Amino acid sequence: GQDMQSLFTQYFQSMTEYGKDLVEKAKTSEIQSQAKAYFEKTHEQLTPLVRSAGTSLVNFFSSLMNLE
Amino acid sequence: GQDMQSLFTQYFQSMTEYGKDLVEKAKTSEIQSQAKAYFEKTHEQLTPLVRSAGTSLVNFFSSLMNLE
Amino acid sequence: GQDMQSLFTQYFQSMTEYGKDLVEKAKTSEIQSQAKAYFEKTHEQLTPLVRSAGTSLVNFFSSLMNLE
Amino acid sequence: GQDMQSLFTQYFQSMTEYGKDLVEKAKTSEIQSQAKAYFEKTHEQLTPLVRSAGTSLVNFFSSLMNLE
Amino acid sequence: GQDMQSLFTQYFQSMTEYGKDLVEKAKTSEIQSQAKAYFEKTHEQLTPLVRSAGTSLVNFFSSLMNLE
Amino acid sequence: GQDMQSLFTQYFQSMTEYGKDLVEKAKTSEIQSQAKAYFEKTHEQLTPLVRSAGTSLVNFFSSLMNLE
Amino acid sequence: GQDMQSLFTQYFQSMTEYGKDLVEKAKTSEIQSQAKAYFEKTHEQLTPLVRSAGTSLVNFFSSLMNLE
Amino acid sequence: GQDMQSLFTQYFQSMTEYGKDLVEKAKTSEIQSQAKAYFEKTHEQLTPLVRSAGTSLVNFFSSLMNLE
Amino acid sequence: GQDMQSLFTQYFQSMTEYGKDLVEKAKTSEIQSQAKAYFEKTHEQLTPLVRSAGTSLVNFFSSLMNLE
Amino acid sequence: GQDMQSLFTQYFQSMTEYGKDLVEKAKTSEIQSQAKAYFEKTHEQLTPLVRSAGTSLVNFFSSLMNLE
Amino acid sequence: GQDMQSLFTQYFQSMTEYGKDLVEKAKTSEIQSQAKAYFEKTHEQLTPLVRSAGTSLVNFFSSLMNLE
Amino acid sequence: GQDMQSLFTQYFQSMTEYGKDLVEKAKTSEIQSQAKAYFEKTHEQLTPLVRSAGTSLVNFFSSLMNLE
Amino acid sequence: GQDMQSLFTQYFQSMTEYGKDLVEKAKTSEIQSQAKAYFEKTHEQLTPLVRSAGTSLVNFFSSLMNLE
Amino acid sequence: GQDMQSLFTQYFQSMTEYGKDLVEKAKTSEIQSQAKAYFEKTHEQLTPLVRSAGTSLVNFFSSLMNLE
Amino acid sequence: GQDMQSLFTQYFQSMTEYGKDLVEKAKTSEIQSQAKAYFEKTHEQLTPLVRSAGTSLVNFFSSLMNLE
Amino acid sequence: GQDMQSLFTQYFQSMTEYGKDLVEKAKTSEIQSQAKAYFEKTHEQLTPLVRSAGTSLVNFFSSLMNLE
Amino acid sequence: GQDMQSLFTQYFQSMTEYGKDLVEKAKTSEIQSQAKAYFEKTHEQLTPLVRSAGTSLVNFFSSLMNLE
Amino acid sequence: GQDMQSLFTQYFQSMTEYGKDLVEKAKTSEIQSQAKAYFEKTHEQLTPLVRSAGTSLVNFFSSLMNLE
Amino acid sequence: GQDMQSLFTQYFQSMTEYGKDLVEKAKTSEIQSQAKAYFEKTHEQLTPLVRSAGTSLVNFFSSLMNLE
Amino acid sequence: GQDMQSLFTQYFQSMTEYGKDLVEKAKTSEIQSQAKAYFEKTHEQLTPLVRSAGTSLVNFFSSLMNLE
Amino acid sequence: GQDMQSLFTQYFQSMTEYGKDLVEKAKTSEIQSQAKAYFEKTHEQLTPLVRSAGTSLVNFFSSLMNLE
Amino acid sequence: GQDMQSLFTQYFQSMTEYGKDLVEKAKTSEIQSQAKAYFEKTHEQLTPLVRSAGTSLVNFFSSLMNLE
Amino acid sequence: GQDMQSLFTQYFQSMTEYGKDLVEKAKTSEIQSQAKAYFEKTHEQLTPLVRSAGTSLVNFFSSLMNLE
Amino acid sequence: GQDMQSLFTQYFQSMTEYGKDLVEKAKTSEIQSQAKAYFEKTHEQLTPLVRSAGTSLVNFFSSLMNLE
């Protein structure tokens, strides 16, 4: 059949600001940090950590992710 | 059949600000941080952590995520 | 059949601000932080943590998420 | 058959502010934080934590989430 | 048959503010925080925690969430 | 048959403020916080915690949520 | 100001037949004819002769039709 | 100001037949004819003769039709 | 200002037949003819003779039609 | 300012037949003829004779049609 | 300013037949003829005779059609 | 300023037949003929006679058509 | 003079258990906690909080505690 | 004069257990905690918090605690 | 004069356990913690926090604690 | 004069366990922690935090603690 | 005069365990930690933090601690 | 005069264990740490942090600590 | 077992004169004389002749005084 | 077992005169004389002749005084 | 076992005169004389003749005084 | 086992005169003389003649005094 | 085992006169003489004649005094 | 084992006069003479004649005094 599973984004005579992480002043601070830190014996199969207009597209067709 | 499972976003003579994480002043603070910290023997299969206009599209067709 | 399970967003001569996490002053504070901290032997299969105009689209077609 | 299970949002000559988490002053405070903290032997299958104009669309077609 | 289970939102010459979590002053306070804290041996299958104009759409078609 | 189980919201030459959690002054206080705290051996199957113009739409068609 | 002088026609799960001139049998007949025939020294300035779901929109903004 | 003088026609899961001039049998007949015939010294300035789902839009912005 | 004087026509999962002049049998007949015939010294400035789903858009911006 | 005077036509999972002049049988007949015939000393300045899904767009920006 | 005076036509998973003049049988007949015939001393300045999905776009920017 | 006066036509997973003049049988007939015949002392300045999916674009930028 | 303001405790061939805070089982409980929590503009001059065989001896001789 | 303001504790052939804070099992609990938490503009001059066989002896001789 | 303001503790053929904070099992708990947390503009002059057989002896002789 | 403000502790053929902070099992817990955390503009002049058989002896003779 | 402000500790044929901080098992825990964390504009003049058999003796004779 | 402000500790045929910080197992933990962390514009004049049988003796004779 | 056969004499802020043989005037006299004089073949085994605050302690543990 | 057969004499802020043989005047006198004089064939085994605060302690542990 | 057969004498801020044989005037007198004079064939085994604060300690451990 | 058969004498801030034989005037007198005079065939085994603060300690460990 | 058979004498800030034989005036007198005079065939084995703060310690370890 | 049979004498900030035989005036007198005079066939084995702060220590380890 006909399948459209996509990100469709069209702009016409437009103005768009987006996905901006803006620090003006920082001191002894941890600001906007994407992190994973301290894992032990963990089993993660589809965990996309995403931020600030970044993109993660996964198209599995008849595929097999096996973590045995 | 006909399948449309997509993100459709069209702009016409428009103005749009979105997904902005903006710090002006920070001191001894932890501000807007996406994090996962301390996991032990965890089993996570589809956990998208997402923020600030970022995108995560997963299209599994006849696929198999096996965590055995 | 015909299936439309999508995010349809159209703009016409419009102005839109949205999904903005804005800090002006921070001191010894933890402000707007998306986090997961301390898990032990946890089983999570579809838990999208989402914030600030970010997007997470999952389209499973005839697929199988198996956590055995 | 014909199935429309979507997010339809159209704008015509309009002005819209929404999903804004705005801090002006913070001191020794924890403000607007999406978090999951301390889980032990937990079984969560569809728990979307969502905030500030973020979106989480799940379209399972003839699919199977098995946590055995 | 014809099925329309959607979020339909149209704007015509309108002005709309909504889903805004706005702090002006905070001190030694915990303000607007979406959180899950301390779970032990919990079984949660469809618990969407949602806030501030965020959206969570789940469309299961002939699908099976099995937590055995 | 014809089924319309949707959220239909149309605006025509209108002005609407809604779903706003607004703090002006806070001190040693816990204000507007959506939380779940301390669960032990709990079984929750459809418990949407929702607040401030956020939305949670669940469309199960011929589906099966099994917590055995 | 805000001015909406338009033809707004929306259809939702509907069936509509309209503006249909259907002849099955005709003999030596004049059937459903829009015509103007024999004018002499006539002065017509806005005369829309319309039929069968046809449309005629006149939008004059600060304009001048002068027949001197 | 904001001006919407337009033809807005949206279709959702609908079926519509319109503006159809269908002849099945004709003999020595004049059927569904749009015509203007025999004019002498006529002065016509905005006369839309429209039929069968046809459209005629006149948008005059600060303009001048002068027939002197 | 913002001006929308347009023909807006959107189709979603729809079926539409329109503007159709269909002859099945004709003999010694004049069927569905758009015509202007015999004019003498005529002055016509904006006369759209339109039919069968045809379209005529006049957008005059600060213009001058002078027939002197 | 922002000006949208256009023909906007979008199709989504739709089926549309329109503007079709179909003759099956003709004998000694004049069927669906667009014509202008016999003019004498005529002055026509904007007369669109349109038919069968054809289109005619006039966009005059600060222009001058002078018939002196 | 921003000016959009255009013919915008987008197709998505659609099927469209239009502007079709189809003769099956003709004898001693004049079928679907666009014609202008016998003019004498005529003054025509913008007269688009259009048919069958054909297109005619006039975009005059600060121009001058002078018939003196 | 920004000016978009164009013919925008995009196709996505679509099927479209249009502008087709198809004769199957003709005898002693004049079928689908675009013609201009017998003009005497005529003054025509912008007269597009268009048919069958053909296109005619006039883009006059600060130009002058002078018929003196 | 002779002043004896003391804690005199003598043991002879004795057995004494005292001041024991003993928890065997605790769950989601706050057990035996000495605390002061949330004071604002408070003036406390001699407030000994004491527990579990702890001791607080204050001997002021000709001294002056001034809280001005 | 003779002043004895002391803690006199003598043991002779004795057995004494005292001041013991003993936890055997704790879960999601706050057990035996000496704490002061959240003070604002407080004035405390002699407030000994004491617990579990701890000792606090204050001997001020002709001294002056001045909090001006 | 003769002044004895002391801690006198003598042991003769004795056995003494005291001031013991003993945890056997802890999970997601805060057990026996001496703490001061969040003070703002506080004035504390003699506040000994003491626990578990610890000792705090203050001997001010003709001294002056001035907090001006 | 004769002044004895001391800690006198003598042992004769004795056995003494005291001031022991003993953890056997800890998980995601904060156990026995002496801490001061988050102070702002605080004025503390004699605040000994003491624990687990530790000692703090202050002997001020004719001295002056001035916090001006 | 004669002044004895001392720590006198004598042992005769004795056995003494004291001031022991003993961890057997720790995981994702903060156990027995002496700390001061986050101070801002604080004024502390005699604050001995003491633990686990440690000692802090201060003997000021005719001295002057001036914090001006 | 005669002044004895000292730490007098004598042992006779005795056995003494004390001031021992003993970790057997640690994982992702912070155990027994003496620390000072994040100070800003702080004024500390006599703050001995002491632990595990360590000693801090201060003997100021006719001295002057001036922090001006 | 525990055996206390001792002379226990403690003094607290007391004044005691005792065991005093004071002669002021003596002439040809025998005053306060402890004596044994003229024994012949005598057998004395435990005969304490004691006077004036003198002390005689006999502690025989499993011993044997044999006068054979 | 525990055995305490001792002379325990403690003094605290006390004044004690004892065991004093004071002669002021003596003439031809025998004053306060301890003596044994004229023994013949005597058998004395434990005869303490004690006076004036003198002391005689006999501690025989498993011993044997044999006068055979 | 534990055995304490000793002379324990402790002094604290005390004044003690004892065991003093003071003669002021003597003439032809025998004053305060300890003597044994004229023994014949005597058998004395433990005879302590003690006076004036003098001391005699006999500690026989598993010993044998044999006068055979 | 533990054995303490000793002379324990401790002085703290005390004044003690003892064991003093003071003659002021003597004439033809025998004053304070310790003597043994005229023995014949005597058998003395442990006879301590002690005076004036003098000391005699006999510690026989598994020893044998044999007078055969 | 542990054996303490000793003369323990400690002085702290004390004043002590003792064991003093002081003659001021003597004439034809025998004053404070320790003597043994006229023995015949005597058998003395442990006879300490001690005076005036003198000391005599006999420590016999597994020894043998044999007078055969 | 551990054996302490010693003369332990420690002085701390003390003043001590002792063991002093002081004659001021003597005439035809015998004052403070230690003597043994006229022995015949005597058997003395351990006879310490000690005076005036003199010392005599006998430490016999596994030794043998044989007077055969």
- What DSSP string runs through chain Q? -EEE-SEEEEEES-EEEEEEEEES--SS---S-------BS-EEEE--EEETT-EEEEEEES-EEEE-
Q: What are phi and psi of E55, to 5 degrees?
A: -135, 145
Task: List C-alpha distances in Å: T1 to M16, N24, Q34, S35, U3.
Answer: 20, 34, 43, 40, 8
Question: Minimal Cα–Cα distance from F3 to chain D, Å?
Answer: 10
Amino acid at Q65: M
On chain A, the residues whose CB falls within 8 A of the CB of C63 are 60
Beta strands in N1-68 (DSSP E): 2-4, 7-12, 15-23, 43-46, 49-51, 55-61, 64-67
Q: Helix, strand, coil shares of chain T as percentages rounded to 5? A: 0, 55, 45
Query: 3-state DSSP call for residue V19?
Result: strand
β-strands B7-12, T7-12 pairing? unpaired
Q: Which residues of T touch U61 (CB under 8 A)?
A: 61-63
Residue U53's SS3 state is: coil
How far is the alpha carbon of D42 from chain P, nearest alpha carbon, in Å? Answer: 16
Give how far O27 is from chain P: nearest CA, Å: 5
Name the residue facing F59 among D5, D18, D51 (closest C-beta). D5
Pairwise CA distance, residues I16 & G11, whole Å: 11
Chains with 3+ CB–CB pairs under 8 A to M are F, N, O, S
- How far is Cα X15 from Cα W16, in angstroms, rounded to an integer? 7
Compute the residue count for chain A. 68
- J50: CB partners within 8 A, 6+ apart: H54, I48, I49, I50, I51, I54, I55, I56, J56, K48, K50, K51
DSSP H38: -
Cα(W46)–Cα(W51) distance, rounded to whole angstroms?
16
- Most B-contacting residue of J3, J6, J7, J13 (CB-CB within 10 A), to test interface: J13
Q: Where are the alpha helices (DSSP H) in R1-68?
A: none
Q: What residues in P contact C28, CB-CB < 8 Å?
A: 38
| Cβ-based neighbours of J23, under 8 Å, separated by 6 or more | I23, I26, J31, J32, K22, K23, K24, K25, K26, K31, K32
Cβ M3 vs Cβ N5: under 8 Å:
yes
Distance between CA atoms of residues O6 and A15, nearest Å: 79
CA–centroid distance for E56 within its chain? 5
Rounded Cα distance between J17 and N9, Å, is 107
Which of chain T's residues have a Cβ under 8 Å away from the Cβ of N12? 4
Chain N interface mutation, best of T12, T14, T15, highest count of N Cβ atoms under 10 Å: T12
Tokens of U7: 């002379």
Closest P-chain CA to N62: P62
The candidate with the shortest Cα–Cα distance to P45, out of T21, U56, F55, O58, is O58
Determine contact: E12 vs chain G, CB below 8 A.
yes
Question: Which residue type, as a one-letter code, is found at position L15?
Answer: M
Our CA-based measurement puts residue P26 at a distance from the nearest CA of chain C, in whole angstroms, of: 14
Kindly provide the residue ranges of all beta strands, DSSP E only, lying in P1-68, ordered along the sequence: 2-4, 7-12, 15-23, 43-46, 49-51, 55-61, 64-67
Q: In which region does residue H36 sit, left (phi positive, over 0), alpha (psi from -120 to 50) or beta (all else)?
A: alpha
**Among chain I residues, CA nearest to D8:** I12
On whether the CB atoms of residues T41 and V42 are closer than 8 A, the answer is no
CB contacts of S67 in chain T (<8 Å) are 43, 45, 67
Q: Name the phi and psi angles at J18, rounded to 5.
A: -160, 165
Among candidate residues W54, M2, D47, B6, the one with its CA nearest the CA of residue V57 = W54
Residues in chain K: 68
Q: Can you tell me the distance from the alpha carbon of D54 to that of D48, in angstroms, rounded to the nearest whole number? A: 11
Is M52 in contact with N51 (CB distance < 8 Å)?
yes
Identity of the residue in E2, E4, E13 whose CB atom sits nearest the CB atom of G2: E13
Closest residue of chain P to U6, computed from CA coordinates = P12
The b/e string for I31-68 (b: 16+ C-beta within 10 A; e otherwise) is bbbbbbbbbbebbbbbbbbbbbbbbbbbbbbebbbbbe
Q: What is the SS3 assignment for K8-65?
A: EEEEECCEEEEEEEEECCCCCCEECCCCCCCEECCEEEECCCECCCCEEEEEEECCEE
* Residue (of E16, B51, A50, E34) closest to C17 by Cα position: E16
**Residue from the list K2, K12, K13 with its beta carbon closest to the beta carbon of A13:** K2
Q: What is the DSSP string of U8-33?
A: EEEEES-EEEEEEEEES--SS-EES-
Reading the block at residue T62, the tokens are 């498993």
Interchain contact Q4–W (C-beta under 8 A): yes
Closest to S59 (Cβ–Cβ): which among U5, U48, U50?
U5
Residue B9 to residue J14: CA distance in whole angstroms:
19
CA X54 to chain centre: 5
CA dist list (Å): S31 to U19, U36, V31: 18, 19, 15
Nearest residue in Q to B38, CA atom: Q28
- The alpha-carbon gap from W18 to the nearest alpha carbon of chain U, in Å, equals 9
The number of CA neighbours under 13 Å toward the Cβ of X5 is: 25
Q: Give dist(CA S66, CA T66) in Å, integer.
A: 5
**Taking Cα atoms as reference points, which of B6, B18, K5 lies closest to residue C11?**
B18
Q: C-alpha W31: how far from its chain's center?
A: 18
Task: Tell me which residue in N28, N38, N40 faces F38 most closely, judged by beta carbons.
Answer: N28
Contact of V49 with U33, CB cutoff 8 Å: no
Distance CA S67, CA T42 (A): 11
Residue D62 C-alpha from the chain's centroid: 24
d(CA E49, CA U14): 77
Method: cryo-EM
C-alpha span between T6 and S67 (Å, rounded): 27
**Contact yes or no for N45/M45 (Cβ under 8 A):** yes
User: What is the token pair recorded at N51?
Assistant: 């617990």
For residue C14, give the 3-state DSSP assignment: coil
- Say which amino acid occupies D64: L
The two beta strands, E55-61 and M7-12, are unpaired
Cα distance between residue J62 and residue R43, in whole Å: 75
Query: Nearest CA to CA, how far is W41 from chain U (Å)?
Result: 10
* Closest Cβ–Cβ partner in B21, B22, B57 for C57: B57
Q: Are the C-beta atoms of residues I1 and C12 closer than 8 Å to each other?
A: no
- The token pair at D41 is 């032997």
Give the amino acid at B20.
Answer: K
CB T55 within 8 A of CB U50: yes
Closest by CA position to T20, among listed E7, P29, G27, S32: S32
What whole-number distance in Å separates Cα of residue N10 and Cα of residue R31? Answer: 37
Local structure of H9: helix, strand or coil: strand
Q: Give the C-alpha separation, D33 to T59, whole Å.
A: 78
Determine the residue type at M46.
L
Count other Cβ atoms within 10 Å, centred on residue M15.
Answer: 10
The residue type of S47 is T
Q: How far is CA V60 from the centre of its chain?
A: 17
Are F32 and D31 in contact by the 8 Å Cβ rule? The answer is: no
- Among the partner-chain residues F2, F4, F13, the one whose CB lies closest to the CB of G4 is F13
Helix, strand or coil, per DSSP, at residue H55: strand
Q: Report the alpha-carbon distance of residue H42 to residue N35 in Å, rounded.
A: 100
User: What gap in Å lies between CA Q61 and CA O61, rounded to an integer?
Assistant: 10
21-60 of B, contacting A, C-beta below 8 A: 21-60
- For residue K40, give both structure tokens: 């004498």
In SS3 terms, O1-68 reads as CEEECCEEEEEECCEEEEEEEEECCCCCCCCCCCCCCCCECCEEEECCEEECCCEEEEEEECCEEEEC
With CA atoms as reference, report the closest residue to N44 among P35, Q43, O47, M34.
Answer: O47
Quick one: which of O43, Q46, N19 has its CA closest to M34? Answer: N19
Neighbours of M34 (CB within 10 A): 22
Whole-Å CA distances, H34 to E37, I37, J21, L32, Q24 = 76, 11, 15, 19, 100
Mark whether W and S touch (3+ CB pairs within 8 Å): no
Q: Which candidate, E62, T62, U42, E43, places its Cα nearest to that of V45?
A: U42
Amino acid letter for position K4: M
| Contact at CB, P18 and O23, closer than 8 angstroms | no
The set of residues, in sequence order, having a beta carbon less than 8 Å from that of X50 and lying 6+ positions away, is V54, W48, W49, W50, W51, W54, W55, W56, X56
Which residue carries 């027994």 as its tokens?
R32
Phi, then psi, of I52 in degrees rounded to 5: 55, 40
What angle (nearest 5°) sits at the alpha carbon of residue P2, between those of residues O66 and P4? 70
J32 vs K37: CB contact, 8 Å cut-off?
no
Distance of alpha carbon U57 from alpha carbon W5, whole angstroms: 10
Six token digits for residue Q28 = 């994702």
> Which residue's structure tokens are 């439309």?
C4
Instruction: Give C63→chain E minimum CA distance, Å.
Output: 10
Which amino acid makes up residue D54?
Answer: G
CA angle E57, E58, E61 (to 5 degrees): 140
Structure tokens at T19: 């065991």
Dihedral over Cα of C27, C32, C34, C40: its sign: positive
Which residues in O lie closer than 8 A to residue U12 (C-beta atoms)?
A: 4
User: What is the SS3 assignment for chain F?
Assistant: CEEECCEEEEEECCEEEEEEEEECCCCCCCCCCCCCCCCECCEEEECCEEECCCEEEEEEECCEEEEC
User: Which amino acid, residue I42?
Assistant: T
What DSSP letter does each residue of chain X carry, written as one string?
Answer: -EEE-SEEEEEES-EEEEEEEEES--SS-EES------EES-EEEE---B-TT-EEEEEEES-EEEE-
Rounded Cα–Cα distance for residues G57 and G60 (Å): 10
H24 vs S27: CA distance, rounded Å: 177
J62 touches chain H (CB under 8 A): no
Best residue in T13, T14, T15 to probe O by mutation, most O CBs within 10 Å? Answer: T13
Which pair of structure tokens corresponds to residue L39? 């003009």
- Paired strand residues for U7: T7, V7
Q: Are residues I8 and J7 in contact, defined by beta-carbon separation less than 8 angstroms?
A: no
- Which neighbouring-strand residues pair with J7? I7, K7
SS3 string, chain W, reads: CEEECCEEEEEECCEEEEEEEEECCCCCCEECCCCCCCEECCEEEECCCECCCCEEEEEEECCEEEEC
* Distance separating alpha carbons of residues C46 and D46, to the nearest angstrom: 5
> Residue U26 contacts by C-beta under 8 Å, 6 or more apart in sequence?
T23, T26, V23, V25, V26, V27, V29, V31, W29
F56, F48 contact by CB (below 8 A): yes
Residue type, R8: F
Per-residue tokens: F53? 């113009």
State yes or no: chains L and K have 3 or more CB pairs below 8 A: yes
Chain O residues near residue D38 by CB distance under 8 angstroms: 28
Token representation of residue I49: 């003779």
Of U47, U46, U28, U26, which Cα lies nearest the Cα of U36? U47
Mind telling me how many Å the CA of T16 is from chain O's nearest CA? 16
Burial category of L8 from C-beta neighbours within 10 Å (exposed 0-12, middle 13-18, buried 19 and up): middle
Instruction: Give the per-residue SS3 of chain A.
Output: CEEECCEEEEEECCEEEEEEEEECCCCCCCCCCCCCCCCECCEEEECCEEECCCEEEEEEECCEEEEC
Residue of P nearest to V15 (CA): P2
Resolution in A: 2.6
- Which residue in the set H14, H29, H62 is minimally distant from G11, CB to CB? H14
Measuring CA to CA, which residue among Q40, J57, H18, K25 is closest to residue G11? H18
Half-sphere exposure of G11 (CA within 13 A, CB side): 22
List the structure tokens of I37. 């015939």
Subunits in contact with chain F (3 or more CB pairs closer than 8 Å): D, E, G, M, N
Q: What is the C-alpha to C-alpha distance for residues H3 and G2, in angstroms, rounded to an integer? A: 6
CB V9 within 8 A of CB U9: yes
Amino acid O4 reads M
Query: Percentages helix, strand, coil for chain G, rounded to the nearest 5?
Result: 0, 55, 45
Collect all residues of chain G within an 8 Å Cβ-Cβ radius of residue E6: none
- In Å, how far is Q13's CA from the nearest CA of chain V? 7
